[PDB]
Design brief:
This is part of a larger assembly, with eight protein chains of eight kinds. Chain D is α+β, with helices and mostly antiparallel strands. Chain D contains two helices and seven strands; from the N terminus they run βαβββββαβ. In chain D, the strands form two sheets. In chain D, strands 1, 2, 3, 6 and 7 form a five-stranded antiparallel β-sheet that branches. Classes of the chains: A mainly alpha, B mainly beta, C mainly alpha, D alpha+beta, E mainly beta, F mainly alpha, G mainly alpha, H alpha+beta. β1 of chain C pairs antiparallel with β3 of chain E. The structure holds two RNA strands.
RNA sequence: GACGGAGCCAGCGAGUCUAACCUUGGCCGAGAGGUCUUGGUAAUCUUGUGAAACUCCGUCGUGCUGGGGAUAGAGCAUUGUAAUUAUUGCUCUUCAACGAGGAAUUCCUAGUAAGCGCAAGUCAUCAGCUUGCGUUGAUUACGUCCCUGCCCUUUGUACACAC
RNA sequence: UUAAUUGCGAUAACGAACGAGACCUUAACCUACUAAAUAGUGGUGCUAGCAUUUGCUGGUUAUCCACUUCUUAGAGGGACUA
């Protein structure tokens, strides 16, 4: 039983890669709020950092927080099997990367201009604002698209 | 206490636009000489017991 | 409902005067004798005729029934 | 040489119960008048053959799927007898609508 | 009912005349009493035998031999 | 008298046998664990990333015991589940074969099961040694 | 009592039930009765039962649900969501927990409390619509006892249903709170207040 | 030799086969005792026929039960149905009907379904509606 | 309620030698799938189709939240010559509206609706469809013609293409 | 009165026919008939294991025998409102 009796060292709402993450919620699920990081990329970083799974976000110490940030930046260095990543085997430089909060939207624009620069059909659909994955546009896509 | 106890002595038959109400003849419990036709909603049998708030309003809309 | 058709009533009628003394209040024996005294294609219909003629046998036992 | 045993098995397939048990009874009574020991005629599961289709040649109207369901009935009979009389039992005891296959076995 | 299969046989033909096609639907009921297959009596039909009743005898006796 | 693993609770047996396996420390955990969601239709490896493999080992041990012999496919089908296919209705999807094969291959060396020349994996005398003993211990805990 | 020893080990908490039939081996049908006239022998409690799941046939005859034990019908009435079709055994799990709650609440058998709640939340009289024109009217007369008990159990379960929605409150304690309040009389529960309101509407639109 | 009668019980599709022989009181379901019958809220329901007439007679009779088909609660009723049937069968074959009729009276008086199978059976489903009765949603314009 | 672990019970099918069908078991593989072999022309081999709801235990704890999976991004596979105007499945990344619903309206009285899954038609691949099969399994009423239709008797009619 | 032009009964109508029904198929009953390695069960029966006062399992017609209650499916029987 993790019956905790601590002092007033709890650390509240925090910033990791300049993203607001609550300190009250458990670390594993609270860390999905950084953009480009989802449920499983947040669970595996915790277990690989060997940090405490059954603990909130205000009880984990600063050093392990920085090492978690380090692991998130470096998936190539912590036995992440390269199929667990977001940017699997990219197009330009061929390296296996993972895109983060300040860059998920950057790459979201990036693939967009490259597609609309090659004048691809998916790119022009992105440009016009329609769907891209070849769905049925006749009945749906009315209230926000 | 404005409560009266009565017992079914005869089921008469179903009335109402939806047929969901039934005419029944009922005689009190606290005395065995006051018997009145009244109406009931749900399923009914003989000798059922009825708690009447006002035991005076004779049945309306008979058939 | 289970109302009996004219066929079963007709068969029971034609059955009762033809074989009245042999018929009895007992449905089981009556259903059995329905084999020798007549031919009914289905056991169900034979049971139907037997069931009707049992009731007619009883009713004749208590008072004459016109028809 | 001394009345070699075969352990023969016969399969009888048909859809019609009356004809299937007609030929089955013919075979069984021939075995009985040969005074033979065997396993009784095993009746296979009632093989219903269920298929559902529209009734409408067009698509207009109420949707009427209705099914043509078959009843394949099979019986297999074990027998232990010489060739000389299993050839008799295969040349006879047949009729249209039933197909009989005779197979040697060690069962 | 199945008496349709038991006793009716049907046959439909298309007949090509100069103007078009005529439909011919011949439906035939054979006599159930005839033929030697299946039932000879309709499900509704009821057949009653003649009882051959006799006069009551009022002289009980024995045939001995 | 006779105390084999059918008079003891199945869930408690699996838990206790997993604890016994953890203490004994002869389970050769394959290492890549905590990356497989244990179900190809699931969305995450278990919450007990430090003992769920041992739970799987104990459960498979009981499964092979209660059956004659079981193959990897009948491990997958039983250890699968209803995948939430998203905007479509649920469908049952076969789980990951990797955990099933590795847990069986693990039990091959301890001796709980063997290759079952007739079929897949079947109980062995060595497995009968420890499983019913665990049942007896848990009965008179 | 010198319990019998069997080659199959049966716990003493099952052996002791041999003396008298005990609902869930904790709640007894002795010293329990329907205190409400007009609902006696309709809120069926006399006959014995141990669990509230029975593979019965009560939709066969007009008044064969009347003899059904009330716990079964009430538990069945917990099965009411649109997503909770089926799960009758989940319903009996919930009733088990809520009966345990009620026993601690009242220094008394919980089934007496639930019987009181049914009797007190069964609306005695209400109205039916009469008049097919624009100016329709609500004509109010008394209610048959079986209709009363069915409304009572439905309203109890509906109060639990509304309270259990979108809150941290456990359904077991919600139902227990609702039942105990309906029995004792507090008007802080949904069923008793709606019973009051329906009867009052009938009292006024006579 | 060993006096053994056989009975069975039946729900919609769960079928239970039981052997009732003169013995020590071994009650099992597919090899597990009556005290480990799943689930716990329904275990006492199969316990019912045992408690209805007291364990003294079962001290002389051991029943072996195997269940195939159906669903979990369908079994849960099927075993108890079969147990009542096997008890009355044995105590008809070997024990006086002065006790046997009291047994059958008690069982059916408690619930008629202990020794009578409820003939409530599913009926086929008709085109135009998911369930046997209900049809699809209707449209107008 | 979701998540995770564990317990873990069917039926109705179908399936290739007039050929590439159904595939067990073992191996590779996070998965998707690939692989060697086995069995089956079929109550036998898939298959006790170990299916899911359900059950137990634990996490979450009123936060549109861990519900939800919409749109979109990247990669891995199978079928097809061919997947682009994403076949489909799989991996990860995103968690949008949606706090249960206005008029209106659909279907339904017992193994019933509804929850749950499976099979099959489709088919080279595609099942949110559908036929069946089952698993769990209600409430309410045993009625009335008020609403909607249909039918009958009478009635009225200048209609009969028939209001 | 019936689900029913289903019947009772009243009758210028009588006797009829088709439809309904009757028919058949499916589902539940049958410790009764017939059986069975393509279905199962019992055998301190064969062999072996388990835990040890003996209970649970694996190869058991091909390692045997006895059977059909569960399974199957033929013939029937069963309710016809008794």
């Amino acid at each position: 039983s993790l019956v905790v009796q601590e002092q007033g060292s709890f650390q509240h709402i925090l910033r990791l890669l300049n993203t607001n993450v609550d300190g009250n919620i458990k670390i594993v699920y609270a860390l999905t709020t950084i953009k480009g990081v989802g449920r499983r990329y947040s669970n595996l970083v915790c277990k690989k950092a060997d940090v405490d799974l059954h603990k909130r976000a205000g009880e984990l110490t600063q050093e392990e927080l920085e090492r978690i940030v380090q692991i998130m930046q470096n998936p190539t260095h912590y036995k992440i099997p390269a199929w667990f990543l977001n940017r699997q085997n990219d197009i330009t430089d061929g390296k296996d990367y993972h895109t983060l909060a300040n860059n998920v939207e950057s790459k979201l624009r990036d693939d967009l201009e490259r597609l609309k620069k090659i004048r691809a059909h998916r790119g022009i659909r992105h440009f016009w604002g329609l769907r891209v994955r070849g769905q049925h546009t006749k009945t749906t896509g009315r209230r926000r698209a | 206490t404005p409560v009266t106890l009565a017992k079914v002595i005869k089921v008469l038959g179903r009335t109402g636009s939806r047929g969901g109400v039934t005419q029944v003849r009922v005689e009190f419990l606290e005395d065995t000489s006051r018997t009145i036709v009244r109406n009931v909603k749900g399923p009914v049998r003989e000798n059922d017991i009825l708690v009447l708030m006002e035991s005076e309003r004779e049945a309306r809309r008979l058939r | 409902g289970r109302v009996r058709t004219k066929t079963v009533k007709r068969a029971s009628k034609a059955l009762i005067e033809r074989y009245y003394p042999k018929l009895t209040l007992d449905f089981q024996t009556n259903k059995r004798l329905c084999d020798e005294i007549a031919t009914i294609q289905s056991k169900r219909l034979r049971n139907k005729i037997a069931g009707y003629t049992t009731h007619l046998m009883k009713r004749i036992q208590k008072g004459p029934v016109r028809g | 040489q001394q009345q070699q045993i075969i352990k023969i098995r016969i399969t009888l397939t048909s859809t019609k119960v009356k004809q299937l048990e007609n030929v089955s009874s013919n075979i069984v009574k021939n075995a009985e008048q040969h005074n033979l020991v065997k396993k009784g005629p095993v009746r296979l599961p009632t093989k219903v053959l269920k298929i559902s289709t529209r009734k409408t040649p067009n698509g207009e109207g109420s949707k009427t799927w209705e099914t043509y369901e078959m009843r394949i009935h099979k019986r297999y009979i074990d027998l232990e007898a010489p060739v000389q009389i299993v050839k008799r039992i295969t040349q006879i005891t047949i009729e249209p609508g039933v197909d009989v296959e005779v197979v040697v076995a060690s069962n | 009912g199945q008496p349709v299969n038991d006793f009716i046989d049907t046959a439909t033909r298309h007949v090509l005349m100069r103007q078009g096609v005529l439909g011919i639907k011949v439906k035939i009921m054979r006599d159930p009493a005839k033929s030697r297959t299946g039932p000879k009596a309709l499900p509704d039909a009821v057949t009653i035998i003649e009882p051959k009743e006799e006069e009551p005898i009022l002289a009980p006796s024995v045939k001995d031999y | 008298p006779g105390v084999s693993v059918r008079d003891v609770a199945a869930q408690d047996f699996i838990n206790a046998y997993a604890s016994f396996l953890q203490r004994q420390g002869k389970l050769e955990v394959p290492g890549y664990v905590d990356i497989v969601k244990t179900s190809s239709g699931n969305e995450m490896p278990p919450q007990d990333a430090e003992g769920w493999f041992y739970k799987r080992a104990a459960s498979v041990a009981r499964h092979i015991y209660m059956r004659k012999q079981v193959g990897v496919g009948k491990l997958n089908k039983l250890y699968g589940g209803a995948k939430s296919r998203g905007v479509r209705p649920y469908k049952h999807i076969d789980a990951s074969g990797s955990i099933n094969r590795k847990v069986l291959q693990a039990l091959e060396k301890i001796g709980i099961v063997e290759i079952s020349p007739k079929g897949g994996r079947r109980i062995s005398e060595n497995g009968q040694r420890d499983l019913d003993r665990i049942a007896a211990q848990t009965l008179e805990e | 009592f010198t319990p019998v020893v069997l080659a199959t080990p049966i716990p003493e908490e099952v052996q002791q039930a041999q003396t008298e039939i005990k609902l869930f081996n904790k709640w007894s049908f002795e010293e329990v009765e329907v205190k409400d006239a007009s609902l006696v022998d309709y809120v069926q409690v006399r006959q014995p039962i141990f669990v509230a799941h029975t593979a019965g046939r009560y939709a066969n005859k007009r008044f064969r649900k009347a003899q059904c034990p009330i716990i079964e019908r009430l538990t069945n009435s917990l099965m009411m969501n649109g997503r909770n079709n089926g799960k009758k055994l989940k319903a009996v799990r919930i009733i088990k927990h809520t009966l345990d709650i009620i026993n601690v609440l009242t220094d008394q058998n919980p089934i007496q409390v639930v019987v009181d709640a049914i009797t007190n939340t069964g609306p005695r009289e209400d109205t039916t619509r009469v008049g097919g024109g624009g100016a329709a009217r609500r004509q109010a007369v008394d209610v048959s006892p079986l209709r009363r008990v069915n409304q009572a159990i439905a309203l109890l379960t509906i109060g639990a249903r509304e309270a259990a929605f979108r809150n941290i409150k456990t359904i077991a304690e919600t139902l227990a709170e609702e039942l105990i309040n309906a029995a004792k009389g507090s008007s802080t529960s949904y069923a008793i207040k709606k019973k009051d309101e329906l009867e009052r509407v009938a009292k006024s639109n006579r | 030799a060993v006096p053994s009668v056989q009975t069975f019980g039946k729900k919609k599709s769960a079928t239970a086969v039981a052997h009732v022989k003169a013995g020590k009181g071994l009650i099992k379901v597919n090899g597990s005792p009556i005290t480990l019958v799943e689930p716990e809220i329904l275990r006492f329901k199969v316990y019912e026929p045992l408690l209805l007439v007291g364990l003294d007679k079962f001290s002389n009779i051991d029943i072996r039960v195997r269940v195939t088909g159906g669903g979990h609660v369908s079994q849960v009723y099927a075993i108890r149905q079969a147990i009542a049937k096997g008890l009355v069968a044995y105590h008809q074959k070997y024990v006086d009907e002065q006790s046997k009729n009291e047994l059958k009276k008690a069982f059916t008086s408690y619930d008629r379904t202990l020794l009578i199978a409820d003939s409530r059976r599913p009926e086929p489903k008709k085109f135009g509606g998911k369930g046997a009765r209900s049809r699809f949603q209707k449209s107008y314009r």
